Amino acid sequence: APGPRFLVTAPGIIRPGGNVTIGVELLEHCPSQVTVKAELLKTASNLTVSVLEAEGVFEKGSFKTLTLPSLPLNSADEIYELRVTGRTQDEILFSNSTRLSFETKRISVFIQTDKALYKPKQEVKFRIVTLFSDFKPYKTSLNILIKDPKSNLIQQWLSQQSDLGVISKTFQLSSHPILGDWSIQVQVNDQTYYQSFQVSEYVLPKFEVTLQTPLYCSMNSKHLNGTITAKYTYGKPVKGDVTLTFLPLSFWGKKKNITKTFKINGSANFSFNDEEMKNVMDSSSSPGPVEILTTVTESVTGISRNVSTNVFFKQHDYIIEFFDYTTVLKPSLNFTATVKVTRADGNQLTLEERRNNVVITVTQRNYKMEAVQKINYTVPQSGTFKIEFPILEDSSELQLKAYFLGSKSSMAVHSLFKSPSKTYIQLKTRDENIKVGSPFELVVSGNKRLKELSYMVVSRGQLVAVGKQNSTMFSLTPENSWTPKACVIVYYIEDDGEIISDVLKIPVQLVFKNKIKLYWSKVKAEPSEKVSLRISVTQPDSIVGIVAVDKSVNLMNASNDITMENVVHELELYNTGYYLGMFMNSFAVFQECGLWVLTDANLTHFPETWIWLDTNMGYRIYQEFEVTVPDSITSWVATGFVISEDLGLGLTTTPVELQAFQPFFIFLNLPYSVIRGEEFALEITIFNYLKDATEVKVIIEKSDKFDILMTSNEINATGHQQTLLVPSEDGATVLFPIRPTHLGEIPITVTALSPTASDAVTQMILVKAEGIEKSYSQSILLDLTDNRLQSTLKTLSFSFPPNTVTGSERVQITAIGDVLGPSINGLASLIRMPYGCGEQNMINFAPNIYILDYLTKKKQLTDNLKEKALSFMRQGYQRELLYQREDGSFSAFGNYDPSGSTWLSAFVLRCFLEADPYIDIDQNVLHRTYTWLKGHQKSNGEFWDPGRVIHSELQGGNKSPVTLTAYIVTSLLGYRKYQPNIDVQESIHFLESEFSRGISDNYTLALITYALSSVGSPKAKEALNMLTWRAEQEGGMQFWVSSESLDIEVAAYALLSHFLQFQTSEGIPIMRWLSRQRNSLGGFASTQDTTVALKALSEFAALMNTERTNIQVTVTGPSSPSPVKFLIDTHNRLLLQTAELAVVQPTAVNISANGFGFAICQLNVVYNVK
Template sequence: IPDIEPSTTTKLTIDGIDGFSFHQEVELEHRSRSISGLIQTDKPMYKPSDMVRFRVIVLDAELKPPANLTFIEVNIFNPEGKVVKKWNAAKLFIGVFEGDLQVPSTPMLGMWSISMTVGEEQIISKTFEVKGCLTSTITVRSPIDLQVVPLMTPLVKHQGLHLTIAAKYDCGNYLDGLAKVELYLNDDELDQMQEFEVHGLSQKWFSFNEKLDVPDNQRNMRVTVTFIEQDTSKDTGYKWFNIYSLEEIGTMITASFVLLTDRTVIKDTEITVYKYPYQVELVKDRLQFRPGLPFKCALQFRYHDGAPAKGISGNVEVGWLGYEKAVMSDDTGLVKLELPINGSIEQFHLDMIMYTNLPSSYNMKPTEPIDLEVTCNKRMSFFVYYVISKGKLIESSFVKIRIPSTKHRLTQIKASEKMFPKAKVVVVTVTKGDEFVWDSLDVDFSHLGNHFDIIVDENVFKLGHETVIKLKGRPGSYVGLAAYDKSLLDISKHHDIFWKSIEEIFNRFHPIHANDADLFHSTGLFVRTNSYTVLSLRGSSERSGYYINRPDIMKFPVQSNFLDTWLWKNVTIGLTGTHQLNETLPNTSASWCLTGFTIDPKYGMRIVQKPVQIKTILPFYIVENLPYSIKRGEVTVLNFTLFSNFKEGCIGSVTLYNVANEMELVGLPTTGDYSLQDECITCELVILTCLLSEESYTKSVVVPPNSGVSISFLVKVRKLGEITVRVKTSTEIGLKMEELEKVVRVVPENILFNKTISRIFTVEHAKPYFLNNTLDITRNLINNSLKVQFLLYLIDNVENLLHTPKAFAAPTMIDFFSNIAVIEYLKSIDSTDKYFNVIDEAEKRLMQKAVAMITTNYHEIMKYHNSDGSFGHWYNSKGSIFLTALIAKSLRLASKHISVVDANKIDKAFNWLASKQHSSGRFDEMGEITYQDLQDGSRNGVALTSYVMIAFLENSHSFKSDKVKSMIDKSVNYVAGLLPNITDVYDLSMATYAMLLHNHSNKAIALNKLIHVSTVNEGSGERYWPRESGTVETTAYGLLCYLQAKYYEDSITMVIWLKNNLKISSRFSNSHEIFVGLQAVARISSIFAPDRIDYVINLHYMKNRTLHFRITGQDENTLRYNEEMGLTIHGASEMISVYIVGNGIGMYQFVYECSVDIRNIAEGFILNVEKEFTNSNNTLNLKVCTSYDPDMAPNRSNKAIVEVNFPSGFAVNKIENVTITNPVQSFELLYNNTTMMVYYTSIGQEWSCFRVTANRSLKAAFNRVAYVLVHDVYKP
């Protein structure tokens, strides 16, 4: 293949020679990339001073290390996109490079990335996060594992269930408690409820009260089990003797410890009841039969657990064929049949009547021949077969049939590692009637290729003991091992590599696209013929051989979160094919996943199918069951369990520390030191002593042998953000103290709103500036929650631009562009540094933060990228004109600031857009309508067409071809031709801007018309374009028109209006308005760069309070002045007066935030919530319905979000649609399933409803109010 560009159209021409008349052309697909790769890190998250260890694995199209590639380039980028470590010539060892990075003690926090480059092309990159605070000393912290399984396969004849219910910690300790079991024959039809005690494990028979009918072969029923862990103190028989001596504290201990420490787990289990003890499947040799030819098939019998059912006897009857035969399943559970088909039969029905009861797999060995029977309805004199794998022709041959026949057995194809992981066998022949007949079969060979096993003789060890790890693989192959706490998988699986990763690489290398018009093309081959008729023996769907084993993709159990790794090592397998390691286990209690991969030059890569589970345990340790988040001011229970593996009982102490005075320790009315041990030790008392002070709270308890004791503390949190929960344990026998530490998120009691007032000012000595600024304070403000900051420049709250959800594409795209606009703005004001002679560190940090954000956004955006170059609203959704235009121009801008942007994807996106232009020049939305003003096309498509043209014209320097320029001319002329009929100011502003960028001959007419329809405030002189919706965006485009026309002085009035109305909220952002507004602000900021600044600012507030400060070009504090003002609100608003005298230009902001009680606030939407507590208040059922206010225009919202925040201690269990007309598009669970975001494409005046069920996992002594909120993404 010649060295050509990937985008070049390539054709293969076939011409006859020597008088043979033949000419055909075939378009070829040119794939430039011949290598790919994987990156593995030892964990997904790091803290300052950690060591990042990683492996880069390079593979070719055959999943082997590239033969001619010795060196690669590896870079590690910080969140700003700057290279912090670089390997220009990283040497590969059997396709693997290992490296590390020491995270600085004061690093830039956020998402870092590792990239691998070959030549000029970036092959792969992977991100990891650096956070400022992670859990430090680790102990086992597993949640309760509740298992509900039937003891035997439930059959309808049983009319009941025999269930096993087990409750234990992952470390293996069984728990005692109370089980409440509810049986539902239908979803809401309760058959019965029983309560009974469970001591670790219980097996119980439940007879149905109502007869269960199974009209089909099976029926599902629901079992809900609520397990309440038993507080050990209730079983001790202890009574509060001598209560008079505890009159101040005894009652409080009883209330807080006994009533509030019962931790609850609820599990819903779907159990299938079957009519028959086994299932049968018809396995066909082909999807269709040919009249006149025998049809081969088999009946596959299996038990419901997948095991083969052998020895099943009965009669097979085939309707319309008159076929009847007594059969019995063989050892593999198969009954093989060959059915005679006469020429008149078009379809038939097969029945099996069984007499008695009972599976199977036919496992191909690497050297075993593939036994195929080639059958044709006409006599064959020859056929040709092809074996295709990984885009290559592995084997082919011409088979001559000496005596023409309708069938021929083919046994010469042997399985080999070249066919790994899957291959396709294609057979073709030509009949005497000039018919080209073919068929194909997919064969799975994923069990071939390389092999690798990890063997550990034991699975449970004491801390610090040694274990022997045995490895088996190909001699000389590389092995990379990793062992990490399996709770890491709950945080992210992104750091590790799995078999699915290999499959994704394979599919990227060798995609075969279905082609209904040319089914043969779907095989990966092509056929060209002058005269033959091409016949297929199958439909468009593929067939697979029934005898091939398919490996299961392993699924890890979900565990609690914390961070630790144990083993990171590479070895080379010796000549014997084995290797043994003696490794010392860590001194940390945890459950570990030991995994690994091997790579061999000849046999390729293999990943261990099932990681080895290893547990390290302490003789005495503590586990936590802490909530993910709690509300400030809420009295919350912090639950822990002490476990003892001693043969005798012991006394253990747990101390909870009040770190940095972040919480109030609740439980005793006064501090003190008291002991009950002398009086009550003979009563088997669990709580022996309690020691409480402001700094710590200690409880001492008796822990029975080989058991656990629950301990809880009542706390009330004082601060927002993150708090550190730290406990230490000790025993009476002097064992080493164990420490457990976890960060818990604290959320505000109410919704926190941010608002901004911004003003641009120009002052001269003769013309001072004065303005009264009124803070917009809602009546629902929570007392004493207002906080106000005075800032001198706009973008200090840049982090607040990133609070839109990310479960769909549009907000992610808009956030991406908003942050690019922030960077452009910050760079535009860099010119002031030459006047100030100072580099402001705060501005530098803002720049770094914005770059980090767009790097993170970029990786998120790529999830919505389609193979045709477009971008959709949801994963794998249809391409959207609006989104593709938005992201194409965003990526072009981003490429100036971050290096990870793929230029080919930008070109492909613009090419896709150009291909969707109508012959008139107009663009119409093809994807979902989520932004009505821009996409609906009701006004001749002027808005969307102009929007697409703006994207092209702002990047016109990148387009050199006459074809693109002609496309742009056509669309701009289309918009210009409609200019006399454009009445909507939103359409007019974008059309005018597009014509100005294009330098169209009608640009002056359009601009004059735009100015004519503007509105000017009589008092302030501010110019804007009012509209029912989109006023800010329209005015921002108007400002861009003024700047493009170089009406600089007149533009200042629009900037002032924009600053007053461009609201940047920390909770919801009118994102599209913001990014257009910021673009306009960035443009004007680059134009107005004052060469001298000297003025005095006076702030007057709260009647008699005043602040004075002076700004000069020589002052190091010039770029920003922060003054936090603790304003006490009197009434519904607060006035702050600003008086500025001197010389210069600038902009100031008042950024203020307040907590708001959102109950009974309605704007734009109608919301109805029905709530019901069931299961002894342990289950919360919500039905949420919302509709769009009929008084609003337009009559539908844009993309909408319903946010459901649950009370502390509740976590989402399931969600289901109630309405079909406008179903939920997607939903996202946040904060350990305590908050749910539900997404709708739009919401109209009809009710859109869903149900959600949440189960209680923890208890709070005093719950704060939870809420449900609905809002429009683009117009919150």
């Protein structure tokens, strides 16, 4: 019979480890039994590999799910197709297949470091937590890699085993590391997960400035008030001078500013009148934010501290906002929204304002006819109130306006979905907070009588629930799989085949069925007191990790710890954006969160860590741990997590606070580092919390490592002690001029004695040497790739200057197995379909082929990217063949242009010379290009370009004829593969004469050096010698100066010249520069330089492409009385192994490598000069 028969829905995505569940519904016109088969196909390269299959039989009137088996996590980005085929017992019913979008996120990985800021020579304690999508533990093998900001692999662990998902590890930082954002990269299966943590020095300011202003402001206010509070670290007020600069941020107009200079004693209040910010609307006209900067300078020290803030300006007396409104119009269905009105200064609204009515105007327009209605509305003390009104069925666009005492606001809805029957259904919820496991209600409202609704719940791009509801009222119980956001899609059919549906996107609060509770023995405890921390876990055989850290981590509001916010962020990262299709309303409401439907029904400050506990409980649901409160006096905060096999993950509901406090103590705001021989100020704050002011004697213990200048009251020891009076419930500061006289970690001990109580604190101070820092670096390549030799000895030496600061010398030696190449994904991003004109084609083509060559010579290929790039440059070769002329010339538009370009001809000639090993290139084309390029040869060997390059970045590359000649010969050098008879000796002599004349520009010199080095001219060695004399080497960083990018091209050509002359060891600093010109932006800027840089790197890889490495590097000599041994193999080839050597003048070492392959050894010397 005619009418609806079936409706099957599926999610549009595919996720490894995600269960592809499809929903099936058969309503009236189906047969008794229908067998639905779901198939997953991996069609790639015309290989329709059917991977996963499922089948299920369903009855009439049954709304059910068919679940495919989970895809394994080892899968990668492949073209995946889902086929659904519903059949009867004797005939087909439907069969269709579609594409599925691939999501790379399959599992959750948390990196939990104890803090986000680390000093040098501190211990980074971290935890790796691997979890399934459903938060069960995930046992797997993984690699951990800790790298410095310069991306040197400084530490690694390989093939670590996750015991119930938790891997607790430590990493000891060096004494003098590279300050910046260190990275922890965890490799699981084939995916990488990152976590950045910063390393820096304290550098404390002695006073801090806080600028209290209202965030929002209006012109009508007479007094725009604000406060500046400059306060010391110990609470004493600061006397000084403040300069206040008020500047509008209207950058279109002038940058005129208001300057106010006056004095401050701790705190000072300022007020602005209306005549000062008039110019803000005279410079430009709605008012935007304005920047207020305060510069506070102390009168006695002159230390200037600058603090900036932004203040928004509002054009109205009050500000009005709307929320809880549907973005799509639903006619004939009461519209509801919520309005909040608040004051311009941000203060609470007055009772007087509550008496005034808000005028709300609604305009429903059929965009023929329109209806404008007004409604009086009230406002509560909080200001939040709901507004409700019906929508006329003919409304096509709604405009809402709110007015209140001159304060205006407005909004509009233009989106509309067309129902031929004019039937709509609104889905709503009353629960403002939805949790997992707690049932929540749901409302459906409709202008017509409703049938038995069918509801389906989707989350994480997976259809997680289905069912049928007979009422217009129903409650649902969310589960863990529903989080973080859930689409509830309700629908029902009509007799004419119309399908009427509605969505509701609800956030779901997550609560774990596994629970952890921490209890302190005492809420308040004295320092150095034994305190028992009790942990309670719901289920035994659980692994727990507890972190107890200072409260300044919460003050930072940015940390690496496993908090509820981090889990929510991971869950929102699990989510994906919706996909656009064929735009029809009944399909669009389904596509709102990516559901693909088939049916017939459509016809017609520095923190410190205390506890890093990690315990694998065996049989106990609770345990106790006796710990010691540190001497630091603070409010420790403890949190933790539990992982169990059955329940999964559980988190502490709240942190637990232990206030380590005593009523009388000592504080030192010591600096991170001081310079020896300098008289620095030591401030000691004696804090007293007794009920009486106390006379306290502060004693500084004498030591040989440092001295105290001013004598003390006693004569037995000079500068030994002072005495002061500390007020009750207050801190008193005392000063001491201390001159260090020793390097390294000096102890400083301070003892406060009073009749009531006493205390003593000992601390470390890192005293460094004075002078100006200097660094020297020398690299050497030990090349045991050749099997003829098996040992290689080198000598690295350096002599310190006579004026070196004694004790400031540090000698490091590092060994590495390979240089740092670009990341594979970063280069893969540059692969693209070459389109546009000939120049755009070449721009989008050349990086692809050069990256392919570099990857081939590095042996890190992936088949899918290989075939993608092969198809891409095959199409690019065809497109360039379309742009090839009859004479072999090439141009952007081919024959449309009047004359081809010899420079572009040489570029494309080099391109096919590079492409010849990868595809078949017609040799007649190559000979045509060769003849056309030879036709431009003059008697003296110089060349000339008749063409013109449209693109400026290619046209702008040193248009002088010398570079043109160098480019054509450096393109023609590769024609020796097919035949070596290339007569360019006259051109080589011309270039030699030009070099003899002396060349000023760096890039011309680089191309010259490459040209004469390729042909083995005798002058090429000398040219390279005066090229590297022009190089600028400072601290193992070699590059070249620019005339005004060009630097990369000169560097790459110099590196290629170095390789061609077998001076491989000298190119290492240039290579490091090439390695440091990619980490800043991923790949390489532009496209002209990427080709030469990747060519140089590929040539380097090819020169020592041995796949096996077993090198042992022994460092001996006067600086190394013990032989320092490094082992380099295929596992730790990238590991920047390091060692420290003793100080001896001259500093010289033998480095003897034995084995097979190649290694790079670098000696670094850091010292200080006077």
